[PDB]
Ligand SMILES: O=c1[nH]cnc2c1ncn2[C@@H]1O[C@H](COP(=O)(O)O)[C@@H](O)[C@H]1O
């Protein structure tokens with residue numbers, strides 16, 4: 001494969017030399033007892049050596065040049081594995097492949113040893129990771145800042161058809177990429193009280209937790225740029241035994257990632273994590289600023305991007321530093337703060353927005369609450385000046401929410417304290433200005449923007465689908481890898497017989513490889529000559545895995561009704577993690593496995609239909625299953641999925657999409673042409689009209705015989721004979737408390753699925769439509785998204801110029 005680079009003779013020689021050297025000196029092993037794991041580590045250290053010179057030169061270059069610095073703060077960075085990504089970005093893949101082969105090893109088998117760095121829940125976490133990759137590739141002096149969790153998202157086991165959570169001890173064998181930096185450890189304060197003297201305010205009597213940074217290299221695509229991701233680790237400050245044991249209390253701050261996707265859990269520990277990242281990060285930012293070329297120019301030299309409201313405390317924290325410590329007058333400090341910060345909102349689901357009770361804030365961060373109240377007062381003074389007499393607007397826009405439990409609306413704080421606020425897909429950003437943040441948009445229309453998400457073509461095409469990346473390069477070269485819009489050139493081949501044959505060959509190759517993986521690793525057998533119908537994403541009610549479930553049972557029931565009637569064979573795969581405390585999501589996973597239990601063992605169905613639940617869906621699994629997918633399920637209720645990103649890996653990897661007009665699905669359909677998509681169901685307007693007159697699930701049940709049959713099968717125990725009432729909760733929700741209107745999209749979804757099967761019956765036309773999708777996926781590269789952030793928000797110009 002040409003996109004994988006050269007395997008120079010000297011390079012290969014040197015690599016084998018360093019591989020053996022590391023096995024000896026670093027791993028302290030000898031070939032006779034070395035395990036595949038040992039070899040994986042020897043290769044990883046060998047590959048890591050190649051990043052060092054560039055890492056040092058890059059950071060040195062920024063200190064010398066002093067460009068504006070981009071600080072991307074996030075509580076999640078779902079990086080996945082690093083070995084292949086590093087070889088790809090450094091053009092070492094073929095060289096290492098040859099070197100390892102000459103050493104009698106299979107590089108791919110070695111790659112399977114590496115643990116996914118799973119410091120993320122799903123979309124938002126992965127976006128942070130794609131963004132890091134694009135910022136480096138675009139030559140931006142960007143710094144990823146987060147927290148080094150000891151345990152990322154739990155490993156999902158399925159036992160008896162149910163999800164079981166196991167700690168994700170990803171650091172057991174170490175992390176060869178990161179570099180501990182204990183020398184740059186910083187103090188973070190908690191609790192305490194505030195004193196107002198003659199020098200202003202003073203935060204005193206605080207408890208200290210130390211933040212120790214660990215730096216990870218972030219390589220751009222062959223431009224010799226290696227940026228940094230700095231993750232903070234909590235350390236206790238500098239009878240007796242119990243006192244030493246109690247050091248765990250402070251160190252617990254960075255122990256584990258809260259496993260919630262699109263759900264706010266107001267736990268004090270989570271608040272600590274948020275302030276922890278923010279306080280330490282901002283000390284780094286101020287220090288760099290001071291040793292650069294004073295505060296008037298701070299915004300010209302610093303950009304702080306908030307990945308949702310998670311690190312929103314950065315606003316009052318910056319004000320605290322500027323006012324309490326640097327002694328800037330409030331007004332000036334605020335001007336600087338707003339010009340420095342920008343907020344990215346990723347959801348409209350109300351239960352996902354952060355609203356911290358004021359008592360928690362008053363106790364844990366007394367000075368920050370005082371600063372927040374002052375920010376609010378001045379902000380509401382401006383609202384009042386702009387809309388005199390509009391008292392309810394004041395109440396609505398306030399950073400303070402009034403109930404039994406007074407809370408602080410973190411999103412309102414972010415809008416008030418940021419010069420830019422953006423949504424993550426056109427429809428979502430428009431919805432923001434129309435509903436949720438309408439008052440704010442009216443007060444400051446210019447603050448509001450859109451930055452449609454993207455995914456990186458390196459990990460999500462070149463790494464995961466080398467076969468596809470190769471046939472594409474065969475026709476248009478390699479420029480598209482960091483200029484995805486060039487994929488448009490592929491429209492010239494919709495009628496090219498060789499390309500049509502190869503696109504289909506590549507997909508079938510991936511399907512065989514994926515089938516081999518499931519047999520080997522999970523001992524699951526799937527029919528390779530079936531349509532691979534895939535819905536992989538976190539289990540949620542709004543994502544409607546349940547709708548997928550209704551369809552699957554429909555397919556089963558239709559086959560049983562007319563057994564001799566031909567149907568396009570399908571392997572329906574659903575995978576994803578459920579937050580541990582999310583009851584319905586866990587019941588849904590169980591229904592999925594229970595459906596398979598019946599469907600997969602009915603002799604009449606045979607291999608015409610199979611339903612499997614893919615265990616432990618994570619980034620590394622996404623890289624295997626997405627390239628093998630024929631149909632991509634993106635069926636959230638219109639208006640609920642802010643953007644989605646899995647939708648865009650599927651499109652880029654040759655799968656056709658069946659989905660609603662939600663999030664970026666809208667833009668995806670627009671780019672490819674609705675005739676090349678399988679859009680169905682209610683649009684946002686329809687959902688609202690239903691909400692206006694009231695959603696009554698009974699009407700659909702009463703009017704659709706096939707739906708009725710399925711609900712009665714669930715309620716009577718057809719999918720749980722030993723426990724007839726097992727799914728009563730799902731049925732009750734669907735029939736009476738379905739916020740996401742599953743029944744309302746059932747008929748159109750089943751009809752749309754019929755249309756999917758019809759096209760699949762025509763391999764040639766299925767493939768030509770696929771080509772029209774791949775060819776128009778360019779807009780969804782994260783390089784485009786990031787270039788937009790740079791020019792429209794950060795005020796810096798991206799660049800593809802190589803470093804020496
Ligand atoms: O005072 C200094 N003298 C010379 N080089 C420096 C100095 N401070 C930082 N650097 C260089 O700039 C890099 C950037 O460090 P940082 O951005 O503060 O993490 C350092 O690793 C050094 O190469």
Ligand SMILES: COC(=O)N[C@]1(C(N)=O)O[C@H](CO)[C@@H](O)[C@H](O)[C@H]1O
Nearest residue numbers: 123124262346347424641642643644
């Ligand atoms: C707190 O809000 C979120 O986490 N929002 C989400 C997500 N759950 O991943 O963010 C990602 C990245 O923007 C979006 O693609 C997705 O539709 C949205 O739901």
Ligand SMILES: *Cc1c(COP(=O)(O)O)cnc(C)c1O
Nearest residue numbers: 122123537618619622644645646
């Ligand atoms: C991309 C990705 C997600 C987000 O997928 P959506 O379908 O947009 O929710 C979640 N998990 C992993 C492992 C991903 O790679």
